[PDB]
Write a protein that binds this ligand. Structure first.
Ligand SMILES: O=C(O)CCC(=O)C(=O)O
Ligand SMILES: [Mn+2]
Lengths: 222, 18
């Protein structure tokens, strides 16, 4: 639907009420397929790398997350449809104005194209932005056709703060997902027994991000 | 539970302005 109607009439309410919003059939089967093909070509270049952590303390990153990823701006040759995806997400966000909590969203990361090879690997329970690095909204587009979690696993399980029941999001094809990045939404990728693709972008809050960039260099002491 | 060591990495540079 019109970015404006989806934003104001669905995304904004869902996000402020529950901190999670799912929009299925975001771009349609044709575009979704084109995106999937671009991701599979990118994977077939062999340029993917192990997913990394903000501050790794574990033996290896593989103990935490078991995916292979790359970062795309959306202007690279062969990624035009991923670019269309990123510009559509941006469209929705711009149309959310300052109605998504009290954040002033002025920027975002590049797209993280991610692949769980399907060998029983996933991502343990975690928070995307526990200690305030600017990330206020997580946006994930899934690409996996006829995915059956009872067979292939790979559920994204979110545990919204305070609620006694978690939520299981299947990584369905053409599904769009929004949720607060901070400690409100601890989540986990359960073991995936099949190749599981997803595209993520993190949107930033101006003030938080600006502070996050200075805290890295020094952080002073106390 | 140290969340910092579990959080997915993002670059510090190369943000995209909206
Ligand atoms: O792919 C998903 O469903 C979530 C990925 C995730 O939580 C992450 O990479 O930080
Ligand atoms: Mn995550």
């Amino acid at each position: 639907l019109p970015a404006l109607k989806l934003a104001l009439e669905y995304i904004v309410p869902a996000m402020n009420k529950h901190g999670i919003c799912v929009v299925d059939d975001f771009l349609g089967k044709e575009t979704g397929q084109q995106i999937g093909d671009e991701v599979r070509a990118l994977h077939d270049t062999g340029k993917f790398t192990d997913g990394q952590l903000v501050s790794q303390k574990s033996d290896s990153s593989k103990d935490i997350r078991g995916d292979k990823i790359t970062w795309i701006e959306g202007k690279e040759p062969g990624c035009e449809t991923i670019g269309l995806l990123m510009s559509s997400m941006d469209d929705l966000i711009r149309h959310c104005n300052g109605k998504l909590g009290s954040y002033k969203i002025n920027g975002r990361t590049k797209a993280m194209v991610a692949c769980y090879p399907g060998n029983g690997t996933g991502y343990v329970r975690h928070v995307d932005n526990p200690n305030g690095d600017g990330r206020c909204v997580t946006c994930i587009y899934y690409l996996n056709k006829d995915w059956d979690a009872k067979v292939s696993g790979g559920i994204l399980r979110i545990f919204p703060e305070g609620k006694a029941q978690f939520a299981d999001i299947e990584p369905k094809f053409d599904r769009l997902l929004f949720f607060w990045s901070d400690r409100r939404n601890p989540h986990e990728v359960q073991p995936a027994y099949a190749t599981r693709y997803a595209i993520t972008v993190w949107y930033f809050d101006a003030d938080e991000r600006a502070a996050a960039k200075v805290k890295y260099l020094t952080g002073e002491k106390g | 539970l140290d969340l910092e060591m579990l959080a997915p990495y993002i670059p510090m540079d190369d943000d995209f302005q909206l």
